Write a protein that binds this ligand. Structure first.
Ligand code: HEM
Ligand code: HEM
Ligand SMILES: Cc1cc(N)nc(CCc2cc(CCN(C)C)cc(F)c2F)c1
Ligand SMILES: Cc1cc(N)nc(CCc2cc(CCN(C)C)cc(F)c2F)c1
Ligand SMILES: C[C@H](O)[C@H](O)[C@H]1CNc2nc(N)[nH]c(=O)c2N1
Ligand SMILES: C[C@H](O)[C@H](O)[C@H]1CNc2nc(N)[nH]c(=O)c2N1
Ligand SMILES: [Cl-]
Ligand SMILES: [Cl-]
Ligand SMILES: [Gd]
Ligand SMILES: [Gd]
Ligand SMILES: [Gd]
Ligand SMILES: [Zn+2]
Lengths: 401, 401
């Protein structure tokens, strides 16, 4: 079992949980591909059996009558129908485990506090839209954000999938421009073109909230506009740089990933959007300063009167720090939940300790856990980590178009 | 079978066909990735044959007279002696190749410019010391640093090794107290206690340059005082924070790793110190701000009058940026070669491009190439990388005790 060192303290542990990793990753003894972003009844039965075992362990009933009854029920149902249905309590536990198991999530200290909305009865794209609006309203909670997931019907033979085409529930449009540039968010050029192609009347601002493209089984996607008062946004200002407000920057309160697949005991839920709250570097560093996103770094450093003609002035570093200050200050001013990268990484360290005691390890992706500014000033930098795949899980899936 | 490698800033794609040559298997398996871990008789002919083939291809001389002749002499040498001696040019070529192959080195754009001192006829810790002294004075070059390596005799059966007990040629002492904690560099507490134990009169200071412990085969070590005028150091001041100088901080000019083992064509050199010049985050971020190193971050924030009461002021990030600024300003004022993390990572992207054309890929350790501050502000953050072991190589090796 892999030995894992923390270099700040000197601590050493062994990740025995990795030995139970079922599915395979991209690395081999020849070559590590850790840094890559994107790496049958009997086999459904064996996944389902393992998950039912996990559920009954969690409720201190391993080996009991009800445990064997459920194992028997599942096999009989797979034999009769080729699939099976989760009980409500099994779904809640499986959604929480999927979050717990997610190696790229630094916020997992919260994994047990998750509101699970059971939308497995959803019938249409119109009902899907109503469920999603309720999710946004509950999770946003006027700025006091609450973690939640809404679970739409599982994949099943004989019918297409429910899908949300948008990558998050709230996203800003990206408009390919006159001179070939992009106005708005360049990460969203494709979904923006698809919304237009499906009848949306575009805007032409930098922060235009996108409509939703929702797909019911065996139906083309259907366009739904979000009511503006459902989408809470934060205008960005800086506590001491008063010209920062004149940049006209904004971001939205709710980070709600909507394009991932939830897998529980062999069953697959292609539509299951989940939401927490932001860590400030996601907005301040990646979304606003990535060269292929809003790319504001040089404009901010020029306004700060930094010497941008030489790298060794560290003008890039200084401007990025103040952009992250602006994000934190603005969300706090607006009373919208946010966590900074120091507090978030410290709480992740507590999670690793909790998980070492509970399960003997924790799957973690070092390159995603370490924040994109001030990496080695956070404790996770000095923590060796072991990356592997446990189920239940959130998985990437192909775009439906 | 050839890993696809994407750059996410630009969208470009390459394939690492070079990876299909990795000898020493790394630590990862399909089951789990250990990429974040710091530390994971006639088979000599196999590695010697392959290395000689490497040599003659690099000089466009595969399949011709001189190439075949050299194959037989190593064959006869190993048959007659159980080992072989490298030609001078091969020793040079192998030193540059080991540098070129180091997955954790961001400065490899320089790999063709390397001064190779051949100390293979050395015998005794006294000869070592004068060799080390020639290197240090050559490499330092009054602050116009020049990359250099010195190659002490190779390992052979039945006889002890040449070893430098220090991890670098210049290290600062670390002294315990009436209370455990360390004055000086906590990373060197152990070699400090060895040097004192072997007869060295310790100092009282936070920046005492340690003596050398040099080990000829089969003899206990011998202490050597480095000539004070040969160890070039930089007192640290800040361009605009006039009190920063009063903190009394300094760092040395020459980074010279002296504890790694150089392997060429199956030959092992446990004493082969190599040196380049510093990238400024090594000093300003890791050495001065790591919690287990000089840990100066809060002292600098106090002097800057920052609000250390809340993490979301980003007082840690601000003080760290100014410490890096002070390192760069001080080294440039002293006319001592240094490179900032923006310049260095941009040069590495060019190196990746060169290596793609020259060899079809480049072994790179993402977690070590990405700098420890401002990670996503540098281009290497957005570049996927493949990590694997090629020979010749620099390898880690046990402490000589
Ligand atoms: C409660 C506060 C939360 C915080 C502060 C947080 C933090 C983060 C951060 C910073 C990332 C990296 C994302 C990126 O760089 O694009 C991430 C990824 C992720 N989070 Fe969390 N998260 C939270 C809640 C949740 C919840 C509620 C779930 C699911 C129930 C979840 C599941 C995931 C998954 C699956 C990923 C990986 C996504 C990907 O690879 O694209 N997180 N989280
Ligand atoms: C010329 C300027 C150079 C620069 C700017 C540079 C930069 C760096 C940096 C920042 C690291 C990371 C090490 C750490 O974080 O502790 C590193 C590692 C390394 N470099 Fe370079 N380097 C240079 C020259 C060289 C030379 C001349 C050699 C050998 C001939 C070399 C071989 C290595 C090796 C083997 C490592 C791995 C160190 C380890 O794993 O402990 N580098 N380099
Ligand atoms: C629930 C939650 C909380 C939080 N605090 N942050 C997030 C952001 C997740 C996220 C991941 C990515 C990786 C894309 N990569 C796979 C190509 C892209 C995104 F656009 C995105 F939003 C989610
Ligand atoms: C030639 C050269 C040039 C340059 N610019 N930098 C270096 C840094 C080498 C180096 C490696 C390490 C890793 C060992 N540790 C993680 C266990 C630690 C250090 F403190 C250190 F200095 C070398
Ligand atoms: C190429 C590299 O893997 C890529 O840029 C990764 C690195 N680490 C990351 N970490 C987080 N949290 N989010 C990301 O999008 C990325 N991107
Ligand atoms: C645990 C982790 O692997 C360790 O802290 C690594 C991370 N990346 C690094 N990168 C560099 N350049 N140098 C280091 O010492 C480290 N340390
Ligand atoms: Cl986001
Ligand atoms: Cl160093
Ligand atoms: Gd002001
Ligand atoms: Gd402007
Ligand atoms: Gd003062
Ligand atoms: Zn790996």
């Amino acid at each position: 079992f892999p030995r894992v060192k923390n270099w700040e303290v000197g601590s050493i542990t062994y990740d025995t949980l990795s030995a139970q990793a079922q599915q395979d990753g991209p690395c081999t003894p020849r070559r590590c591909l850790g840094s890559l972003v994107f790496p049958a009844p009997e086999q459904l039965l064996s996944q389902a059996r393992d998950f039912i075992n996990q559920y009954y362990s969690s409720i201190k009933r391993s080996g009991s009558q009800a445990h064997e009854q459920r194992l028997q029920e599942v096999e009989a149902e797979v034999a009769a129908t080729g699939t099976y249905q989760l009980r409500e309590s099994e779904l809640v536990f499986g959604a929480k485990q999927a979050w717990r198991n997610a190696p790229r999530c630094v916020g997992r200290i919260q994994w047990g506090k998750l509101q699970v909305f059971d939308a497995r009865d959803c019938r249409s794209a119109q009902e899907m839209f109503t469920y999603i609006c309720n999710h946004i309203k509950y999770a946003t909670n006027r700025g006091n954000l609450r973690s939640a997931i809404t679970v739409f019907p599982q994949r099943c033979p004989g019918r297409g999938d429910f899908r949300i085409w948008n990558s998050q529930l709230v996203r800003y449009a990206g408009y390919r421009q006159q001179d070939g540039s992009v106005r708005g968010d360049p990460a969203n050029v494709e979904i923006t073109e698809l919304c237009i192609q499906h009848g949306w009347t575009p805007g032409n601002g930098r922060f235009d909230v996108l409509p939703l493209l929702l797909q019911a089984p065996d139906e083309p996607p259907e366009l739904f506009l979000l009511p503006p008062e459902l989408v809470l946004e934060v205008p960005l200002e800086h506590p001491t740089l008063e010209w920062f407000a004149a940049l006209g920057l904004r971001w939205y309160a709710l980070p709600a990933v909507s394009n991932m697949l939830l897998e529980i005991g062999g069953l697959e839920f292609p539509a299951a959007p989940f939401s927490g709250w932001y860590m400030s570097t996601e907005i301040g560093t990646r979304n606003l300063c990535d060269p292929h996103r809003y790319n504001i770094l040089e404009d901010v450093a020029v306004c700060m009167d930094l010497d941008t003609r030489t790298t060794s002035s560290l003008w890039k570093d200084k401007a990025a720090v103040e952009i992250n200050v602006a994000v934190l200050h603005s969300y706090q001013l607006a009373k919208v939940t946010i966590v900074d990268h120091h507090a978030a990484t410290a709480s992740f360290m507590k999670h690793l300790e909790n998980e070492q005691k509970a399960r003997g390890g924790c799957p973690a992706d070092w390159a995603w856990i370490v924040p994109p500014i001030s990496g080695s000033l956070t404790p996770v930098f000095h923590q060796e980590m072991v990356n592997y795949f446990l189920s239940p899980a959130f998985r990437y899936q192909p775009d439906p178009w």
